[PDB]
Amino acid sequence: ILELVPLSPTSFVTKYLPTFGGTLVSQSLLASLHTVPLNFFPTSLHSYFIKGGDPRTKITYHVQNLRNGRNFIHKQVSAYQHDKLIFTSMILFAVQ
Amino acid sequence: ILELVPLSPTSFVTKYLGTFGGTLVSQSLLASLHTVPLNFFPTSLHSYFIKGGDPRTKITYHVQNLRNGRNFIHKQVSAYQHDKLIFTSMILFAVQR
Amino acid sequence: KILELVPLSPTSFVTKYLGTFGGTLVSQSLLASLHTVPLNFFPTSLHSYFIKGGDPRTKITYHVQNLRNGRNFIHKQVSAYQHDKLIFTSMILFAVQR
Amino acid sequence: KILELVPLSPTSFVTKYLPTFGGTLVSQSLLASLHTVPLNFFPTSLHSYFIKGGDPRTKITYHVQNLRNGRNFIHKQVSAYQHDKLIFTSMILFAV
Numbered sequence: 531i532l533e534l535v536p537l538s539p540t541s542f543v544t545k546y547l548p549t550f551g552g553t554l555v556s557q558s559l560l561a562s563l564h565t566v567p568l569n570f571f572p573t574s575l576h577s578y579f580i581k582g583g584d585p586r587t588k589i590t591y592h593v594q595n596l597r598n599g600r601n602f603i604h605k606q607v608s609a610y611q612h613d614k615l616i617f618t619s620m621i622l623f624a625v626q
Numbered sequence: 627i628l629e630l631v632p633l634s635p636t637s638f639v640t641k642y643l644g645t646f647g648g649t650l651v652s653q654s655l656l657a658s659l660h661t662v663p664l665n666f667f668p669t670s671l672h673s674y675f676i677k678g679g680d681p682r683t684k685i686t687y688h689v690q691n692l693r694n695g696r697n698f699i700h701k702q703v704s705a706y707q708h709d710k711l712i713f714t715s716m717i718l719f720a721v722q723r
Numbered sequence: 724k725i726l727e728l729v730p731l732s733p734t735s736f737v738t739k740y741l742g743t744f745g746g747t748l749v750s751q752s753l754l755a756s757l758h759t760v761p762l763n764f765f766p767t768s769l770h771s772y773f774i775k776g777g778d779p780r781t782k783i784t785y786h787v788q789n790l791r792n793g794r795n796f797i798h799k800q801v802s803a804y805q806h807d808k809l810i811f812t813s814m815i816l817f818a819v820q821r
Numbered sequence: 822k823i824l825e826l827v828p829l830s831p832t833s834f835v836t837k838y839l840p841t842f843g844g845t846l847v848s849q850s851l852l853a854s855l856h857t858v859p860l861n862f863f864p865t866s867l868h869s870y871f872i873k874g875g876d877p878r879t880k881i882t883y884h885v886q887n888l889r890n891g892r893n894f895i896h897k898q899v900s901a902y903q904h905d906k907l908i909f910t911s912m913i914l915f916a917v
Contacts, residue, residue: 532645541793551668552628552655556648563644572647574889576912577671578870580767594791594798596770596814597866606770608816613795615767615818620868620912669907670898672888695833695884697905716888718900720907726844742855745864746824746848753844765871766843772866 532556534591540565542591549583551617558607558619561591570603570623577619587611601625628653630687636661638687646681647673654703654715657687662699666719669698673715683707697721726750734759734787744777748811752801755785756815764797764817771813781805795819824848832857832885841875841908850899850911853883862895862915869911879903893917 534542534557542561555577562572589609596604602624609617630638630653638657651673659668679685685705692700698720705713728736728751736755749771756766777783784804791798796818803811826834826849834853840846847869854864875881881901888896894916901909 532648540791550627550652551671552648552652555651555655555671556645559644559648559651572644572675574672574674575651576673576868577651578872578910579668579670580870580872582667592793592796594814594816597772604770606768606814606816608767608796610795613819613821615795618768618870620770669900670910672896672898672912674889693832693886696882697902697907698884698900700886716886716898718886718898723905743824743848743852745867746844746851749847749851749867749869750844753847768868768870769843769847770866770868773864 532560534561536564540593544589547587548585548589551577551579554579554589554609554617555619557589558591558609558617559621562593562605562607562621565593565605566603566623569626573622573624575619575621577617579617581614581616583616584611596620628656630657632660636689638689640684643682643684646679647675650685650705650713651715653685654687654705654713655717658689658701658703658717661689661701662719665722666699667722668717669720670718671715673713676711676713679707679712685712692716726754728755728785730758736785738783741779741782744779745773748777748783748803749813751783752785752803752811752813753815755787756799756801759787759789759799760797760817763820765820767816767818769813769815771811773811775808775810777810778805783810790814824852826853826883828856834883836881840877840879840881843869843871846875846881846901846909847911849881850883850901850909851913853885854897854899854913857885858895858897858915862917865914865916867911867913869909871909873906873908875903875908881908888912
C-alpha cells in the first residue's frame, strides 16, 4: 500500500487512500522510476510541500521530463488532490 | 510507521527490518520531525543518494541544526551503515502560528 | 518595462531593446509563456537551463512550445535563441485557479 | 537597481525598493545566491516554485540555504518571505 496505478506513460494514482510527506516523497519517487531507463539511478531529489493532506482522497502524480541527456535525466513529479497541486518533486538521475 | 528508536534527542536507529530510497527519505524525515516543535512542518526536503545500503543492516540517523531564521528551521539528517555515510537530507521547516 | 518583448506570432517573441543575463532570460521566458495561457492559469514552477552565454549586443528570440495539457495544468517549453543558436530553455508549469 | 538587495547577514537579503512579479522573484533570488558562491562558480540551472502570491507593496526577504558543496558543484536553495510567510523558493545549481 505505497501502490500506484498507471493511468498513462506519465500519470499514476494511488490504489489505496493516503497526509504523511514521506508517502508523498516515496510514491513520487516510484512514479519517476517507471519513466526512466533501468540503467539510470537517482542521485538526488528535492521535494516541496505546497499544501497539506487529506487522507480521504486519492493522489494523482504526473511526471514531466525537464531535461535529458546521455548521462543525466531530470524529472519533475507533481501531485494533485481535488484538482489542486499539493506537492512537487524534482528528481535527478544519472547513468551507470 | 517506519519506526525509529531514539538514542538521544538527536540520533535514531531503525527499530525493524527504489522503496529503499523512499525509506531513507521517510525515516530521515521522521527523525527530523522528532527534533522540531509541534507546529513546525516541512516546507521542503533535499536528499542526496551517497552510496547504496543493505537492508539488512540497521540505519543510524543523526539530526543536526544548520542555521535558523525568523520563520524556519534548517535540519541536516545523515544516515549511516557501518560508520559510513549512506544518505543525507536537508529538511526545511516553517511555523503556522 | 526594459524586459518588453515584441510578439512575432502567438508563440514567438523577440526583445525590443538590447551575473544576470540570467535573470533577464528567465524573466522574459516567463513573460513570453504568460502570453500563451489564459488569465487564470498561474505558474507553479519553472526550470531553467543555462546552455550558452548570451551576447547583449544581439536580439533574443523566444519560442513557446506546448508540451502537455492535463485537466488542471499546462506545461510549456520556452527556448531562447541568438543567431539561430539555442542559448537557454525553461520548462514552465502552470495550474488553473478557480 | 530596483533588483537591488541589502545584505543583512552572510545569507539574508532584503529588497531596497518596493517589488510580486515572478520574474523579479527569480532574478532577486539568483542575485542573492551569487553573493554566497565563489566567483569562479556559474549557474547551470535554476528551479523556482511559486508558493503563495506576493504583494509588491511589501519588502521581500531572501534566505540562502546551502544544500550541497563539492569542488566541482554547489547546490543552493533560496527562500523568499513576506510578513513571515514563505512565498517562493528556488534551487540554483552551480558548476566550476
